[PDB]
Structure 1
């Protein structure tokens, strides 16, 4: 009966899309992951316990003899002493700080946890921060809104069995984030020939022309979308839509207006 490594997953300022993205994994499927590879010891979306029963389970995993890994989804709201984001009557920052203290490692799943994400966009009413900023601790960042399950599960498996993968300047594993979306785009020959859709209704759009003039942030976004696809079937540009640059820090302010370049 081999011990499986403990994983505590916290939800802070999030929309739960990263949790949803995670459970789309097919190599392996989530059930094989949680029955065979890890011991998923706290996960509010799917755990059976509620309330004080739940909160105890967290405090059991945190006090586990063999330690644990920390998965964080969501940013941290810091205004009014963290009180705009609370669980079991504690500010999220407080609980995340507690959990980070003793973690073997910290994986930030999604742009929110990694860099602050949507609630941190101007004018940032909740004074939201990414984890490493709120805690002052190094994180492994798996950004995207949400990231591909391939990138998250790949990271998790890599950490448990190989070690900490090589990270770039923004804490992203080079295994998945080493290349520009644009460099792997099937529309790149259109880009190189200056064949651009001027609008979504144009004949050019119908002919699958490059979406750059409609705001495509492919040339400035690091992600593996066109190589690995989503849900084994598709990706935005294939579905005719520009990339939003959703894996880039603070993209909500640096890649907007989304239908422009300016």
Structure 2
């Protein structure tokens, strides 16, 4: 990229998120986040990092949205709670009217080029939708479908995702769009999504079948304490067998570690996370 290159507008809306999907993106190594923001995308609205505030920030997003109707990318971090008329997530106020996450996704969703549901909360409901919750936490694709909004959705799950999955999916899409235009490009992206809406370059391979401890698993050699790094982690709760992600290769935080080496995989990219992956510390 260059400082003077083409950079599409992006709005980043936080529903029932924890900001960890924004933070994970800040950890991108190459390209660095500075390069992403200055050379790849134009991040026009993001509540955690943008200069302006309040109704002025909302109106700025609305002005960009009008200018780029059908052409901006909408990132959603967190689930969308539908109970209590949307009141469990208020994202702003303008014209003396509060704006719920429900309202915001009904407003901007129809006019985005594509919605990127970043993180397991946005993609699948995640922890806010888990047993014991009461907010009607809803995944982005389901909310949009329930409301008749046909905009394409790409899921980039994980709790959090690896930065490379987020940046890499953006790069995938922008490449396809450069080659084929917007609709042709998004069609090429959709072709490489699995049945859970995830890009197969990052989510097409199983952790366990590629795990360095697979021989120990097959031998029945299981660690009995977390600090035994020789044995397989299955008896300690590892969910690698049921998890589709490339962490075994890419690892985390500049390659310094990953969940299976350090402790166990908890299946954080999967649609049933957390309840279908729990208890975390037994098989």
Q: Structure 1 unaligned runs (5+)?
A: none
Please report how far the alpha carbon of residue 207 of structure 1 lies from its aligned counterpart in structure 2 after TM superposition: 4.4
Please report how far the alpha carbon of residue 134 of structure 1 lies from its aligned counterpart in structure 2 after TM superposition: 1.1
Q: Structure 2 unaligned runs (5+)?
A: 93-97, 177-184
Gap change, CA 1:2 and 1:199, over 3 Å in 2: closer
Please report how far the alpha carbon of residue 198 of structure 1 lies from its aligned counterpart in structure 2 after TM superposition: 2.6
The answer (yes or no) to whether the contact 2:14–2:91 under 8 Å persists in 1 is no
Pick from 140, 145, 151 the counterpart of residue 165 of structure 2.
Answer: 151
Cα RMSD between the aligned structures?
1.3
Question: What is the DSSP-based 3-state SS (H/G/I as helix, E as strand, rest coil) of the residue aligned with 1:167?
Answer: coil
The answer (yes or no) to whether the contact 1:114–1:139 under 8 Å persists in 2 is no
Pick from 204, 211, 218 the counterpart of residue 192 of structure 1.
Answer: 218
Q: Deviations over 1:155-196 (max 9, x none)?
A: 001111223430001000000000111122111111111100
The answer (yes or no) to whether the contact 2:229–2:261 under 8 Å persists in 1 is no
Q: What CA distance in whole angstroms lies between the structure 1 residues aligned with 2:250 and 2:68?
A: 38
In the TM superposition, structure 1's runs of 4+ consecutive aligned residues that sit over 4 Å from their partners are: none
The equivalent residue for 2:232 is: 210
The equivalent residue for 2:205 is: 179
The equivalent residue for 1:116 is: 125
The answer (yes or no) to whether the contact 2:207–2:248 under 8 Å persists in 1 is yes
The answer (yes or no) to whether the contact 1:188–1:210 under 8 Å persists in 2 is yes
Q: Residues 1-262 of structure 1 correspond to what in structure 2 (within 5 A)?
A: 1-65=4-68, 67-88=71-92, 89-136=98-145, 137=150, 138-162=152-176, 163-164=185-186, 165=189, 166-200=192-226, 205-232=227-254, 233-239=256-262, 241-261=263-283
Which deviates the most, 11-20 or 133-142? 133-142
Q: What CA distance in whole angstroms lies between the structure 2 residues aligned with 1:250 and 1:93?
A: 23
Q: What CA distance in whole angstroms lies between the structure 2 residues aligned with 1:64 and 1:160?
A: 20
Q: What CA distance in whole angstroms lies between the structure 2 residues aligned with 1:231 and 1:211?
A: 21
The answer (yes or no) to whether the contact 1:11–1:73 under 8 Å persists in 2 is yes
Q: What CA distance in whole angstroms lies between the structure 1 residues aligned with 2:267 and 2:122?
A: 16
- Count of residue correspondences: 256
